[PDB]
Ligand binder design. Sequence first.
Ligand code: OH
Ligand code: ZN
Ligand code: ZN
Length: 228
Amino acid sequence: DQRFGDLVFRQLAPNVWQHTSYLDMPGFGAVASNGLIVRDGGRVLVVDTAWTDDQTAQILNWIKQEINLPVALAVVTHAHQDKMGGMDALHAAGIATYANALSNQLAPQEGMVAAQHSLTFAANGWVEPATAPNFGPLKVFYPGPGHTSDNITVGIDGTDIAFGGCLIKDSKAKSLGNLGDADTEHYAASARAFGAAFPKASMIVMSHSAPDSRAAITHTARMADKLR
Ligand SMILES: [O-]
Ligand SMILES: [Zn+2]
Ligand SMILES: [Zn+2]
């Protein structure tokens, strides 16, 4: 771990880092949320904002210090604050932003600023390529409704890493976290669909646990079986 102001950064693979930010949300403690930073040749790609604009600007500061290449785009994985709370900071920095069309639709009512561009998805869940131009190694997949109706996931080609966002919790988790906007009927199938989309990913990264093996997926799905 690298502490940088109030955030934490951890290298996961040669061109991949996890960003972590915290929100002291009254009645729950200081909640960590993780996203990703990927160097693709001469540019940087970001998955998820931090909770706030200020924290997200700090992610960009860390990138400037440690990588020193332009951030070409960011993709955010649903319309909750931990994933989209820093959209304004990305826009102020001139970064092109992407989210599930449904996330952009939901953003205002969730108190979020929408991304600039909307991703749409084929019936099988893979992103429609025209809507994710220049995504390089980021392979975006909609696994079905789970943690939220709009949750999306991202594999990183050239690595063993797939990012489940808030859909997936680690193999030791006692709960599925914030289910306030969850789809209880479809959660288990959506967790399993994420696993099936990225079958060779041995490192599973997620919002509210440290990186884990694929047991994160099986355990999450087995816990989600109890929601039905
Ligand atoms: O979330
Ligand atoms: Zn969420
Ligand atoms: Zn979350």
